[PDB]
Amino acid sequence: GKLSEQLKHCNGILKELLSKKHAAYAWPFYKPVDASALGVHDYHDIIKHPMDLSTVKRKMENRDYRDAQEFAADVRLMFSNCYKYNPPDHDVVAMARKLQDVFEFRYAKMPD
C-alpha cells in the first residue's frame, strides 16, 4: 500500500541518489559488487552483508522497509561496507563520502 510520510521522504532520497546530478560519485553503488568481475576474491570474506542502491530500491518497492530507520540502516551499511573493504585514500571511498554527505543531509530533513 501507500508508503508512510517518512518512507515517502526516504523514497525521494533514493531517487535523488540514483539521479544524474550525483552519478559521478554514485555509480559504483548502483548495483551489487560483483567480486569475481572486479577481481576482489576476498570481498565476501570481508563483507558479510553486501548492500547497494538497486537492492534498497527493490526493498522499497516491495515494501520491505517498515520504517525510515530500517531504510537508513541499509544505506549506511552500503557505505560502511565500502569503508571496511577499501583503504581510506582510495577513489571509491572519496565517492562514498560524497554520496553519504548527500544522503545524511537530506535524511536529516525527515518530516515529522
Ligand X SMILES: C[C@H](O)COC[C@H](C)O
Ligand Y SMILES: COC(=O)[C@H](C)[C@@H]1N=C(c2ccc(Cl)cc2)c2cc(OC)ccc2-n2c(C)nnc21
**Rule CB under 6 A: which residues touch ligand Y?**
28-29, 33, 38, 40, 43, 82, 85-86, 91-92
Q: Which residues of 33-47 are buried (b: 16+ CB within 10 A; e: fewer)?
A: bebeeeebeebeeeb
d(CA 51, CA 29) in angstroms, rounded, equals 9
**Among 55, 104, 106, 107, contact with ligand X (rule: CB under 6 A):** 104
Query: And the C-alpha cell for 86?
Result: 577499501
Quick one: what does residue 101 bind among ligand X, ligand Y, Cl ion, none, with the CB cut-off 5 to 8 Å set by partner type?
Answer: ligand X
**Binding test (CB under 5 A) with Cl ion, winner from 40, 73, 77, 92:** 73
